[PDB]
Write a protein that binds this ligand. Sequence first.
Ligand SMILES: *O=[S@]([N])(=O)C1=NN=C([N]C([C])=O)S1
Ligand SMILES: CC(=O)Nc1nnc(S(N)(=O)=O)s1
Ligand SMILES: [Zn+2]
Ligand SMILES: [Zn+2]
Ligand SMILES: [Zn+2]
Lengths: 206, 205, 206, 205
Amino acid sequence: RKVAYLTFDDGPGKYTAELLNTLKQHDAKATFFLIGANVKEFPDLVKRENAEGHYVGMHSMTHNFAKLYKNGEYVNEMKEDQGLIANIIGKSPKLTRPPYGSMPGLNEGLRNKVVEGGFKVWDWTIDSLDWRYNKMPVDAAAAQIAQNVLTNATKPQEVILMHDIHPQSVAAVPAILKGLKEKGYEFEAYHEESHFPVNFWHDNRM
Amino acid sequence: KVAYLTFDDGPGKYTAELLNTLKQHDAKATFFLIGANVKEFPDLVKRENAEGHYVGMHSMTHNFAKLYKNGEYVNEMKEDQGLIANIIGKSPKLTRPPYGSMPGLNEGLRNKVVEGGFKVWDWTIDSLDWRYNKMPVDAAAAQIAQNVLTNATKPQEVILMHDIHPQSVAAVPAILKGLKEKGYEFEAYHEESHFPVNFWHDNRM
Amino acid sequence: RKVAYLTFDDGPGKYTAELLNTLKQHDAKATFFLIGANVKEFPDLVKRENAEGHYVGMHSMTHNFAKLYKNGEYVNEMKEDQGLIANIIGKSPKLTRPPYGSMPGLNEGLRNKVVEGGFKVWDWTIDSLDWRYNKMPVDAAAAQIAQNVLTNATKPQEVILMHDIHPQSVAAVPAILKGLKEKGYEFEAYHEESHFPVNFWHDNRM
Amino acid sequence: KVAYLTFDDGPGKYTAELLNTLKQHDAKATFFLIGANVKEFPDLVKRENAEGHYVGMHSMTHNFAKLYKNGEYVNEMKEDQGLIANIIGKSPKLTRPPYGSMPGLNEGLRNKVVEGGFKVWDWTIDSLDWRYNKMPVDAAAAQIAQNVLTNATKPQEVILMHDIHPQSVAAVPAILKGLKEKGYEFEAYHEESHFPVNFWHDNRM
Ligand SMILES: *O=[S@]([N])(=O)C1=NN=C([N]C([C])=O)S1
Ligand SMILES: CC(=O)Nc1nnc(S(N)(=O)=O)s1
Ligand SMILES: [Zn+2]
Ligand SMILES: [Zn+2]
Ligand SMILES: [Zn+2]
């Protein structure tokens, strides 16, 4: 049995909504890591993502490496975010997705507090790199970002990294969805009850 | 089968001469105008719209830094619209980016344009008139025409030309006769007829 | 009457020679814009690029936008860069390729000095974007770089921008020669005997 | 079909018993060792080569930022190779980058690795042994075995495992049994047999 966990980072944003509709059409559930500023300006998008079966998770407030990691504000920022997410969906999500990835910012110090505070941390196994295709016709970048993801679905579980704040990205996801599904994947959201670790540090306390 | 003639960087001194050649061939075209040329040639603007041609927008400065690296595009395009609306009494939606949307019109600016209510048009055929500048008008023109005819192949096509260069205006009469024999029709843009023609393949425009 | 002007920027470098061989294997000629620092340290690659029929032209000494344009060193650096190249190959090439392209750095005033100094200036009609595919498998980067270039060869002449100093770039060169050839192109170097303008300023003085 | 067992981050506590199970099933493997563990367990290092396995480098600091943002990868690999040679009297060339070559081994570094004479190896199969750390070894080993077995399809396979974890070494016995049933042979790397296995698909390594 194969499962493909789509994750969309640094949202929600102006393309988020159209992306929410493409999932709807393929009966496909997904996972969202949101920056707290976008949580404030697009709050109906949060509830929609949630109301529609997807996991809503944290991605810090500032998305700033210096503040997150060298000053150690990761746990604070993820908490404050969870605050906003909760005043909006009525659950405190515990899973977080570090800006720029846990490697190497989330040192053993932070990782210890990460665990002390109740949070889990996801990285990914597949980097669509969608956000680097910002300089070409959109139908074409989409086709490449799709090829990028399709040709790396091998392991029964894969955690695909995307960004819902870029048009080429959302444009890709249809081709992705068709493909993985015909490769035998199912498109599930993260489930806290079902947690398993996925991080660059091999640290199975997250 | 439809062909859309487009004329950038005007109005200017040959625009008059050009408007007549279009009149005589019962040909409607499209004009993307610079604000300062709109300020200086308001007569030509009134006539352009008067004669069935579409009147559209080509910014205020035709300045690459300001439009794209400073994100003034939608600002300049809009103030340009004011200028035009004060002369023809409608506010046009269609903009043609100086130097084209690629890549100056980033995903961000492309939001603001969509949000501001504008479409964006590029072209499919570059007459390349600017190569034959300050050159014998008809020598240059026959070549400008030759460029255009031989890249006319697709059912619809949009043609980049500049009515501020004499060899360009000179190439127009011959282009009209050649494209009709290819089975095209010579139309202006219609806002209700809108369809996307942009390098980004961005169908929100 | 289809001609493709392959151009290679920031060279020469550690992948340049392999590229020179693929070119000889497909008996195809191309154009090289070179950085003076690379001129000096790979001088035998300059002499050979020239020796094998390709055009050798200048790409400045510092590839530094502030110095080239906001200080107006373009003409200077392009003449000094020429100086080195002449001392290796014995001709003073006329054609320059501005770092980051003439738009917008090469203003009315610089462009004046350019025309005054005898030089010509080229940009391109296709940006392969090769240099951006730095963060994925190389065989896969090449393929996208190839489709990027193959799907934009439309005009009778096209000037293709590439960098001979990245591995993914030279790997696309094979696939590209294959595809354009059956799309009807011939691979020539720039000949100053046959110069014509190609720039963003539409300035046919250069 | 040939199957290449690799063991990272060692030697350590369980390396010895692993070596008995390998010797016991007439099985040859590949060990990528860390310089501090080479200094601490020379008899294991000495033993590993002596029993026909390959001994390779997995860095000096297993520290992602030093290796790749500071380009100390080659340096740490050269120094590690040294420590290792002082024990087995040859200098190995095959390295296994901590955290895999993607994406920390840039074109710049991949150059230096090729210049310095080294190859680089990633894996085909990730045992995922690290998930079941500090867990019931019985269960953990069983799942770990399955993980690997359920991914044995390609004629050649390079498997990532860690001989510093009890659950991994415990899994090895059953892994050898399943793959030996799928007709695999269990070879060690040989440098004169080298072929590229890296995420970059850089066939210079
Ligand atoms: O989508 S995010 N959280 O902005 C990113 N996480 N890692 C990224 N890129 C690199 C190079 O680390 S982006
Ligand atoms: C974004 C961008 O401008 N890329 C480049 N344009 N020309 C380049 S050069 N001097 O290496 O060939 S890079
Ligand atoms: Zn992010
Ligand atoms: Zn213009
Ligand atoms: Zn390791």
